[PDB]
């Protein structure tokens, strides 16, 4: 460990255009491994990683049937929320849920998640104790009451501490993946002349995974140079990520600036500078 199994669920109503769009996406350690989408040619659970192709037909059938049951349940929820918020039958609305477990290297649950959003805003969430709920507003208070009455927190706790953990263990064994996957970034600095004897130094990090990364520019050493341009981390399209940070510096001073790249794949932080020619 540590490892995690998480499901991201989406239900989107589209009145006038048919039944809601319903999707479930599963992630082992932040890598998608299964997907259900009601809008697919054939609505069924699909392997999204090669190692999942190992699972037999009964698994696919059972999970597909659960998805279909879940789908029906969210159709009902979408209507319920319309009532709670006194909204019209004509609008399009969205329920999202994140559900799952993060387990520590000792194989014990670190945290369980059961979090709901409505129209992109927190609606209700299971607290870290896995016993109580945090409702975001008065509508969620209705749900909170229902679930308190039904012992929902206890049902979820059994799922999160038991079932979720156990499946994660099986999925990891399927993938032969108990060491987290990592690709170290490869970095370089590009040089772009600007008018009036100025120079853009752009420090690139390419081909890294997972996405989490930090880039900094330093003057000499220990400089937390503030006014960098920076782009949000972005997918390259081949499974890896890209990022850059730049500074503008005086022509002839490039050699005093240092770029630093911090990533879990690296034996230690990278340091680099512009390489003239």
């Amino acid at each position: 460990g540590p490892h995690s199994l998480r499901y991201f669920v989406t239900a989107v109503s589209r009145p006038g255009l048919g039944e809601p769009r319903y999707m479930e996406v599963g992630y082992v350690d932040d890598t998608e491994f299964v997907r259900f989408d009601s809008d697919a040619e054939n609505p069924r659970y699909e392997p999204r990683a090669r190692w999942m192709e190992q699972e037999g037909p009964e698994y696919w059938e059972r999970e597909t049937q659960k998805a279909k049951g879940n789908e029906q349940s969210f159709r009902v929820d979408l209507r319920t929320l319309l009532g709670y918020y006194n909204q019209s039958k004509g609008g399009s609305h969205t329920i999202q849920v994140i559900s799952g477990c993060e387990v520590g290297s000792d194989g014990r649950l670190l945290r369980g998640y059961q979090q709901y959003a409505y129209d992109g805003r927190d609606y209700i969430a299971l607290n870290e104790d896995l016993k109580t709920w945090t409702a975001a507003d008065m509508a969620a208070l209705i749900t909170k009451h229902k679930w308190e009455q039904a012992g929902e927190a206890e049902r979820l706790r059994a799922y999160l501490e038991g079932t979720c953990v156990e499946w994660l263990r099986r999925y990891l064994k399927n993938g032969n993946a108990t060491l987290l996957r990592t690709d170290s970034p490869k970095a370089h600095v590009t040089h772009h002349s600007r008018p009036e004897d100025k120079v853009t130094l752009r420090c690139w990090a390419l081909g890294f995974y997972p996405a989490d990364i930090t880039l900094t520019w330093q003057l000499n050493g220990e400089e937390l140079i503030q006014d960098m341009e920076l782009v949000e981390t972005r997918p390259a399209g081949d499974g890896t990520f890209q990022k850059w940070a730049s500074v503008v510096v005086p022509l002839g001073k490039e050699q005093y600036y240092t770029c630093h790249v911090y990533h879990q794949g690296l034996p230690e932080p990278l340091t680099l500078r512009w390489e003239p020619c």
């Binding site: 059972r62 659960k66 049951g69 879940n70 319920t80 559900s99 749900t143």
Partner: peptide, 8 residues
């Protein structure tokens, strides 16, 4: 395997 959701 995903959890079975209860109604809101």
């Amino acid at each position: 395997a995903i959890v079975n959701y209860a109604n809101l």
